[PDB]
Ligand binder design. Structure first.
Ligand SMILES: *[C@@H]1O[C@H](CO)[C@@H](O[C@@H]2O[C@H](CO)[C@@H](O)[C@H](O)[C@H]2NC(C)=O)[C@H](O)[C@H]1NC(C)=O
Ligand SMILES: *[C@@H]1O[C@H](CO)[C@@H](O[C@@H]2O[C@H](CO)[C@@H](O)[C@H](O)[C@H]2NC(C)=O)[C@H](O)[C@H]1NC(C)=O
Ligand SMILES: *[C@@H]1O[C@H](CO)[C@@H](O[C@@H]2O[C@H](CO)[C@@H](O)[C@H](O)[C@H]2NC(C)=O)[C@H](O)[C@H]1NC(C)=O
Ligand SMILES: *[C@@H]1O[C@H](CO)[C@@H](O[C@@H]2O[C@H](CO)[C@@H](O)[C@H](O)[C@H]2NC(C)=O)[C@H](O)[C@H]1NC(C)=O
Ligand code: NAG
Ligand code: NAG
Ligand code: NAG
Ligand code: NAG
Ligand code: NAG
Ligand code: NAG
Ligand code: NAG
Ligand code: NAG
Lengths: 600, 600
């Protein structure tokens, strides 16, 4: 009755308790979906016929500050794994430390950047030390959840498309592998995932560690598995991320891949007897600052719908039933009715009201106190890992005639700055789009620049993503010293509430939900007609970034967990560009709750 | 600030705190809908723009046995009124004692029939005494809820189409009115409702009591209110039951009235400035034995959908929005989004299994013990106010050749009997349909007859509705003595579970519902493909009668309140005619849970 799971090289498969085995898995990120709904998605996953999941452990989700760890409630990954086990699902764990995943900085904590020249995903001694410490914290929590110790964990990913990274460090991989073996034991099954081309496996694979690839419908399947077999002559064929859809970018049209094309490809993969994981099965949500970025800079939106088999709000889609039908070819699917798409409710129009700009509330926003520096400091340099940062200086010259805010020594404003002087908004600045802007003000006037972190790049080489001013800020090639920066405690500020482009300002509105209705509150979608861009919280929960005027995302997912009946619902919007709220028309100064999402 | 509500004869209206007032009400029966959902319907009623409700107090719902009263939880009418008041809705109370309402025996308790020749709705001293006692119990509970005492009760109905009853007793009405004035005070506003023809008001109205009529879309509105004015020259015009739809009968096709026809008529009524109540606004449910009957006998089904503006399960229908739109012509409608149609879930097919016939379980069904009588006793005579009754005797003659079960002295088998001998089902008997049946058995064989109460007549003269055998049971005009009757405690029996027509037998099946799903359990509809007729309980809650083979009702409403997650769901079906469960096909021996009702 002992649980003996191990790769069967002879018969190119897995063996579970002596029986041939191959897994049909789907990715689910417990962190892009609220814990309130975890069971739901996982049960749907079981009802789809998957027998395993493939999930990432984002290091930054559990250690926002060095040595500070969060693992309870919404932070309780171990409970998530235990719940999956209770549902009869196996688990493929992917603990990184880099996960990509269109997630902030690939999971790595921003405070790593406190060493300016430090190198991530390399043999950098400080990087390796921090990685080791994180592993020494995380992995003992996973140890009792390993299959051979009676839990659902059957295989473990060590990296993610490591062949795409510039370093090509095999000492780094060896160091990771030694530490994983040390903390987790020799029994664990360790694997890699890389792009389906031998060039990437060249720098990704490693001895004493199984090698796998990923690929979607636009790859020769034969060629892909031939590429894998060139690195793993014996053992199961595995596609760890067979893409069912694709990520989005703001402005870029929403990617859509036909359902039945994915279905046909999936059938083809299954017919070879391989192991496939559907990335993503549910996409979930890009919370406040969890989004990543590519290069050339292009942040991912709030919605992570992904065109996944389960929609952002968990709806059963035609894709879901198609994939269930395909999977039922190769395994009996669980009996019983499938949990439904959640109910949606249109709460309708809710009004807001100008509360205060960031500048006029920094003390409430930053009650510990501000930061002073000779030259500007970056987001990391000011010890604010997310959010927005206020840069303040004095004008050294009279600017009665519009003077040009222009280049800095090496084009290092990232990623967006809203510029103003003594509460007079001057316009916008951004990377690759707008770096020059005429401004006006008297000599000695207070210049305030609000810098937004639009997301740390999550893929490629450009992980040294400073965020804000690093270099000597210059106006018309004229230097600027004596800077005061302001980190903003937006989360506690929203949770407490002190208890013609419009300057970044807060608009607070309320709405009530009746008590005693069994099927209220329900999940919903928030729309911002007439707004431009900002951040939104409900009852202190940061739902993420909105940008309807840029699109393609319009609605934001609102999980019903955050609404409280009888007690007033208190929405706070931080608008960065424009609000319909100056004139005498109040109806325009409203957001809306809708039932059917509109994201593309 | 004193609350002064009274009829304004001068200006043909009501006055509320000195202001002209007319009400736009809808009927809601707190008892045909589970308390779990009361708020829901009432809030929808508020969102429809109604400012009052018109509801019945069924005497039999609160006093099933003489001197035994139930008023807590699901029995807490006073809490229902208080909840309505809390929602800002006024209340029109209609406490009967007869309510018609397609409800059992017009609300009157069946034990009144323990006096065989007693007369209901007359000056019968025992009837008047029982009525008085009921009023003396009920009305002091309503007193603090009266408008002038700070509650939502503004007017009170004393009868219901009294002009349709044969007695034409004005002493009876005077007695009621005196008792109502005595217990409730002179301040109360008292009114009547009758069919819209002077002939009925002739016997319905009464001095010192306001007179109103009811009528639907097939009545001359001018003529109807002229008829009212002939009895009330001054005061508001009132239609207390403007029918938006109609009741159903088993077998009779489901009545449907076009939405917009009702809308046009409603607008016409409103334009006269009258007071109108929409009967029904929600219909709700016909539980276990709460249905009524007409003459010639025709029981109402389980569904009381009524084609009401709110569907049986509370869905917003095109009729609802149409009526809201009409009402918004004459009054501002409440602000905010309207509570939605409830979510529905298809739990799918659930199997059952033959447990035991009634005969083989009477001890468990009747643990106090059976009844013995020289000649058969009626349902009332055996002190079982609902349910089914077992009649047992011995065959006095050899019946090797089929002998005719035939007439009794005055055709008094009501309403349906399933006949068998020692567990050999012989067929069916019913009133006006089948009273003759050939049977076979040896002399001295035990003859068991299972008699179903299909519903006590709720309208007309025929309230002396015995239910079962009253007269000397005869086979081929041959008398039968030495009877043993068996009252069945079906409710406690289901709640405990001891912890080719098929004989009436119990089939128990289970189904499980996953835990941790925020939007599960949901309301549902149960279907019985292949079954014929019987009673169904879930977790001991008697959902009512099913009869798909007769129709028009197929599905049964299942409110989500009765489902319990993790704990097994235990459905019990008492089938009276036929089950698909003898052969080796188990799939046929299943009921189904569906999401969309199919009732017509
Ligand atoms: C910002 O300007 C200061 C001006 O002093 C720079 O500081 C000097 O930079 C030169 C190179 O440009 C070095 O050789 C000196 O050693 C620096 N001196 C000090 C005291 O730091 C600074 O490097 C500039 N930084 C940026 C990012 O432009
Ligand atoms: C949303 O705003 C309402 C309005 O103040 C809050 O309701 C009060 O919250 C305070 C907490 O600071 C309590 O002390 C009061 O008792 C609450 N009012 C009542 C009538 O009880 C509500 O708490 C706010 N919600 C959130 C999530 O902050
Ligand atoms: C059932 O049969 C019995 C037979 O005795 C009837 O009892 C007699 O009925 C006659 C009228 O038919 C009366 O005059 C007698 O006074 C009754 N005698 C007794 C002792 O009751 C009885 O009435 C019959 N009942 C029915 C409903 O048919
Ligand atoms: C439905 O049937 C199940 C199966 O027995 C019941 O579950 C048990 O109920 C008994 C009560 O007699 C408890 O003592 C047991 O502890 C229950 N089982 C477990 C595992 O806890 C369930 O109670 C039944 N439901 C209803 C409403 O009768
Ligand atoms: C893939 O490539 C192999 C050889 O390179 C070829 O035989 C096969 O037909 C190709 N299939 C597809 C779908 O491109
Ligand atoms: C910017 O600086 C240059 C110095 O060469 C000066 O000539 C120019 O006038 C400045 N710009 C403005 C708008 O004054
Ligand atoms: C900047 O700060 C230094 C610190 O002493 C001060 O000497 C200098 O005058 C300041 N310059 C301006 C422009 O405020
Ligand atoms: C919500 O805020 C508005 C702002 O005027 C206020 O009128 C309203 O009463 C508030 N809602 C509740 C339930 O108090
Ligand atoms: C109703 O009857 C009155 C007089 O009896 C008549 O004037 C009116 O036109 C009738 N209206 C309808 C709708 O029958
Ligand atoms: C019924 O009773 C009559 C008595 O007149 C008898 O003649 C007849 O045979 C009986 N019926 C049967 C089926 O025996
Ligand atoms: C009916 O009961 C009486 C009561 O004593 C008994 O005398 C009689 O024999 C019984 N008759 C039958 C047919 O059982
Ligand atoms: C429900 O009853 C069936 C009858 O065989 C049984 O197999 C099943 O285990 C029961 N369900 C649960 C959850 O125990």
């Amino acid at each position: 009755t002992q649980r003996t799971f191990k790769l069967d090289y002879s018969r190119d498969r897995f063996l579970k308790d002596g029986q041939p085995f191959r897994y049909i898995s789907g990715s689910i990120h417990y962190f892009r979906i609220p814990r309130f709904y975890w069971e739901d998605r996982l049960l749907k996953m079981k009802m789809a016929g998957l027998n395993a999941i493939q999930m990432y452990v984002p290091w930054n989700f559990h250690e926002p500050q060095p040595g500070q760890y969060e693992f309870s409630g919404d932070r309780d990954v171990e409970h998530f794994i235990q719940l999956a086990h209770e549902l009869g699902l196996l688990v493929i764990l992917r603990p990184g430390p880099y996960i990509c995943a269109e997630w902030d900085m690939g999971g790595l904590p921003a405070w790593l950047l406190e060493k300016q020249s430090i190198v991530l995903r390399s043999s950098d001694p400080d990087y390796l030390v921090a990685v080791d410490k994180w592993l020494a914290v995380l992995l003992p929590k996973m140890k009792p959840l390993l299959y051979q110790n009676g839990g659902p964990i059957i295989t473990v990913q060590v990296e993610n498309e490591y062949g795409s990274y510039f370093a090509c460090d095999y000492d780094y991989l060896r160091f990771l592998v030694h530490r994983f073996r040390y903390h987790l034991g020799n029994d664990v099954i360790l694997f890699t995932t890389d792009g389906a081309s031998e060039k990437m496996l060249k720098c990704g694979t490693l001895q004493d560690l199984y090698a796998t690839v990923d690929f979607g419908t636009g790859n020769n399947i034969t060629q892909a598995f031939l590429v894998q077999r060139k690195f793993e002559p014996k053992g199961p064929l595995i596609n760890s991320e067979f893409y069912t859809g694709w990520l989005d970018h703001w402005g870029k049209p929403h990617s859509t891949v036909k359902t039945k094309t994915l279905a046909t490809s999936l059938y083809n993969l299954l017919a070879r007897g391989a192991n496939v994981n559907l990335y993503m099965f549910i996409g979930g949500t890009n919370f406040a600052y969890w989004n990543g970025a590519n290069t050339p800079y292009e942040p991912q939106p709030t919605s992570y719908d992904y065109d996944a088999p389960l929609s952002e709000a968990g709806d059963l889609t035609k894709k879901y039933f198609a994939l269930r039908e395909v999977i039922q070819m190769f395994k009996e699917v669980p009996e019983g009715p499938i949990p439904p798409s959640t109910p949606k409710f249109a709460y309708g129009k809710v009004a807001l009201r100008k509360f205060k700009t960031v500048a006029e509330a920094l003390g409430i926003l930053c009650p510990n106190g501000p930061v002073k520096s000779l030259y500007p400091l970056t987001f990391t340099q000011v010890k604010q890992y997310f959010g927005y940062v206020l840069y303040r200086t004095t004008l050294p010259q009279d600017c009665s005639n519009p003077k040009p805010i222009f280049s800095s020594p090496f084009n290092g404003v990232r990623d967006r700055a809203y510029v103003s002087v003594d509460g007079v908004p001057q316009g916008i600045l951004d990377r690759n789009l707008m770096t020059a802007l005429n401004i006006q003000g008297k000599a000695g006037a207070t210049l305030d620049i609000l810098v937004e972190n639009m997301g740390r790049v999550n893929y490629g080489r450009f992980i040294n993503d400073f965020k804000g001013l690093i270099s000597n800020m210059t106006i018309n090639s004229t230097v600027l010293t004596n800077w005061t920066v302001f980190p903003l405690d937006t989360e506690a500020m929203v949770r407490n509430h002190l208890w013609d482009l419009i300057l970044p300002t807060f608009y607070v509105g309320n709405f009530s939900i009746p008590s005693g209705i069994p099927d209220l509150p329900q999940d919903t979608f928030i729309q911002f007609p007439g707004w431009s861009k900002g951040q939104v919280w409900i009852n202190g929960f940061n739902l993420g970034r909105y940008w309807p005027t840029m699109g393609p995302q319009k609605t934001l997912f609102v999980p019903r967990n955050i609404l409280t009946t009888s007690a007033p619902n208190n929405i706070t919007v931080l608008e960065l560009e424009f609000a319909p709220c100056s004139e005498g028309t109040p109806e325009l100064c409203t957001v809306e709750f809708v039932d059917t999402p509109v994201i593309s």
